[PDB]
């Protein structure tokens, strides 16, 4: 006899944002009370009967907490239902952001693993890794302390498309565990493969004199709707593919007016899946005189 | 969306005999989406220990479920199945007809 509690659009919410708690019980979204973990059996707001979902807006730090709901059950020894599943509202933006980096890198072969390392010069007690999206839950790790930084290694994988996307990480300090830092700079984690690798080539070719034009052509018999041109160490270009007479799919990346060059690979991708890339093309080295 | 209202059959596992243990079945099928509420009723009152089969579907993608409970039929007792579904404004009751 448990209600189902949920937060929308995200239980991880910036301060000043908005989150709605919904309590669904016996085919209804009404007539329920809320409780916080530290003070159970004492309803919040002096026992406010929520006749509708609870919209917290704008979100403040006082909204952060670990919630359960009980729905009105009129013929019962308490008059109320059992406690719902717990939902933890985490309010972000309350400390300087940590940093997030991928080892060995953010392009992850299908089936393989990647470490996402969160770290800060602030002594965070816990670190949270959150993948962008509606109704997405964070992973938590204790912060390890060494050499004046705290850090945590989040292991992601075996990589597949459900794990690809934009990640951010967060720190919390000892006595405000439901208050999170500002988010780290975002990191896009991309899965490469198993879509077949395209072909890379340059026009007129890979040897460019100063002041001459170089265009990089990514090509495939697969119908990629977009190609990503990726340079070793840089520069991340995207272009739509166009179908050619010989049935190849192709995008032409003009370089210049003074690109210095380097080794290039290209990847195909598809509409509405921006973090699923094909296998990398064979590399192509461009040298500007 | 394509929404399909449920078909309902109420019947016993074996030919009913007053005083002999049996099983009361309510077979629901042809419906979409899959959320559905099914109650077996005795004299209008919901029977408690009702089980149902695992959700599956037909080649046309509509769902079917069997709801069942052990019961000893009597002449004094009236059984039915009560079904509610988004395609139904109001719950639909099908009486168990022993004759057929």
């Amino acid at each position: 006899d448990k209600p189902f509690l949920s937060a929308w659009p995200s239980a991880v919410v910036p301060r000043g944002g908005h989150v709605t708690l919904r309590c669904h019980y016996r085919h209804r979204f009404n007539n329920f009370m809320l409780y916080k973990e530290d003070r159970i059996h004492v309803p919040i707001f002096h026992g406010r009967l929520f006749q509708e979902s609870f919209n917290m807006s704008p979100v403040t730090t006082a909204h952060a907490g670990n919630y359960t709901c009980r729905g009105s059950h009129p013929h019962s020894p308490t008059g109320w239902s059992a406690a719902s599943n717990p939902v933890v509202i985490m309010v972000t933006g309350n400390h300087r952001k940590p940093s997030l980096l991928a080892h060995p890198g953010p392009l992850v072969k299908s089936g393989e693993r990647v470490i996402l390392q969160c770290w800060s010069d602030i002594m965070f007690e816990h670190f949270f890794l959150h993948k962008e999206g509606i109704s997405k839950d964070p992973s938590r790790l204790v912060g390890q302390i060494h050499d004046g930084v705290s850090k945590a290694n989040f292991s992601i994988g075996p990589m597949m498309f459900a794990l690809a996307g934009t990640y951010r990480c967060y720190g919390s300090v000892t006595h405000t565990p439901y208050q999170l830092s500002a988010p780290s700079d975002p990191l896009d984690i991309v899965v490469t493969g198993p879509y077949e690798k395209p072909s890379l080539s340059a026009q007129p070719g890979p040897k460019v004199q100063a002041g001459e034009s170089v265009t990089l052509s990514c090509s495939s018999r697969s119908s990629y709707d977009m190609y990503h041109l990726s340079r070793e160490g840089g520069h991340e270009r995207r272009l739509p593919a166009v179908r050619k007479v010989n049935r190849t799919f192709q995008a032409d990346f003009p370089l210049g007016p003074a690109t210095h060059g380097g080794t290039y690979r290209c990847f195909g991708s598809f509409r509405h899946s921006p973090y699923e890339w094909s296998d990398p093309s064979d590399p192509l080295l461009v040298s500007v005189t | 969306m394509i929404q399909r209202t449920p078909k309902i059959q109420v019947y016993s596992r074996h030919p009913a005999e007053n005083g002999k243990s049996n099983f009361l079945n309510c077979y629901v099928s042809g419906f979409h989406p899959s959320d559905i509420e099914v109650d077996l009723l005795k004299n209008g009152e919901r029977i408690e220990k009702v089980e149902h089969s695992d959700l599956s579907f037909s080649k046309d993608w509509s769902f079917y479920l069997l709801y069942y409970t052990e019961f000893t039929p009597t002449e004094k007792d009236e059984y039915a199945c009560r079904v509610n579904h988004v395609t139904l404004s109001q719950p639909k009751i099908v009486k168990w007809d022993r004759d057929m």
Binding site: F4, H24 | F23, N25, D54, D99, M100
Partner: protein
């Protein structure tokens, strides 16, 4: 006889009412033999027919791992389908999946199947050649382009030609005494008046396996297919099935009507008539 194995997946979003939910069931012919439900506590593939229960722990661990993986896959495919059709994140949607194989009496593959649906309508299907797809709309054409670029048909084909047939042959052995023994229907005819000049004859078939059956009413040998009311074949709850067929007849003409029953468990078709 011929035999088939099918797996059916239902993946459902239900925003604000539950977590995204993944349900899988496995069938040999008309007999359900396994299930997985991500809503249970500690989801796992579980036996649903006695003849699978003595598969070892290596079987269930591999099945449970596969189902957990597919639940994660199809939870995300629901989000993808939202973008393909430009639908709100507040509504409830359903993906359905079917695959499996048909084998002949020698146990060799006759054909493979793999079809997908979104919100109860065809979405994409593997063709009979097991190496190409047919897409039902422009959203599914995106999926087709992706599955072509990833050579997904080759993986379906390897399974359908290999493990699918191999396991189906194993399950048919495990449950031979129930899966390959046709139980004939028990039959009778009932009579009920509807007025002072018409009555219903109802031909009953009970307790039969497998579910395939033909019930017909004839009058002077002519098939009354248009005047016959046939109910959907229905499960008895004990892995047998039930069906009936009814015709409305002028009172006094009942002797003209015969019910005909065909079923794998009958060595010859049955003819029935009603008698007071």
């Amino acid at each position: 006889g011929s035999h088939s194995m099918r797996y059916f997946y239902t993946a459902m979003s239900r925003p604000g009412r539950g977590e995204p939910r993944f349900i899988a069931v496995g069938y040999v012919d008309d007999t359900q033999f396994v299930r997985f439900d991500s809503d249970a506590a500690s989801p796992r593939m579980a036996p649903r027919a006695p003849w699978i229960e003595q598969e070892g722990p290596e079987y269930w661990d591999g099945e449970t791992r596969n189902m957990k993986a597919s639940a994660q896959t199809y939870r995300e495919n629901l989000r993808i389908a939202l973008r393909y059709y430009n639908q709100s994140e507040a509504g409830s949607h359903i993906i359905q999946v079917m695959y499996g194989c048909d084998v002949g009496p020698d146990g060799r593959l006759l054909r493979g199947h793999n079809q997908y649906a979104y919100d109860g309508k065809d979405y994409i299907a593997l063709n009979e050649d097991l190496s190409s797809w047919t897409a039902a709309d422009t959203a599914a054409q995106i999926t087709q382009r992706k599955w072509e670029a990833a050579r997904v048909a080759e993986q379906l084909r390897a399974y359908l030609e290999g493990l699918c047939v191999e396991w189906l042959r194993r399950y048919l052995e495990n449950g031979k005494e129930t899966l390959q023994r046709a139980d004939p229907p028990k039959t009778h005819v009932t009579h009920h008046p509807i007025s002072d000049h018409e009555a219903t004859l109802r031909c009953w078939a009970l307790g039969f396996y497998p579910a395939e059956i033909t019930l017909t009413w004839q009058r002077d040998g002519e098939d009354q297919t248009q005047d016959t009311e046939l109910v959907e074949t229905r499960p008895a709850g004990d892995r047998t099935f039930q069906k009936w067929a009814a015709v409305v007849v002028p009172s006094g003409e009942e002797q003209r009507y015969t019910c005909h029953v065909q079923h794998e468990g009958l060595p010859k078709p049955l003819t029935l008539r009603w008698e007071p």
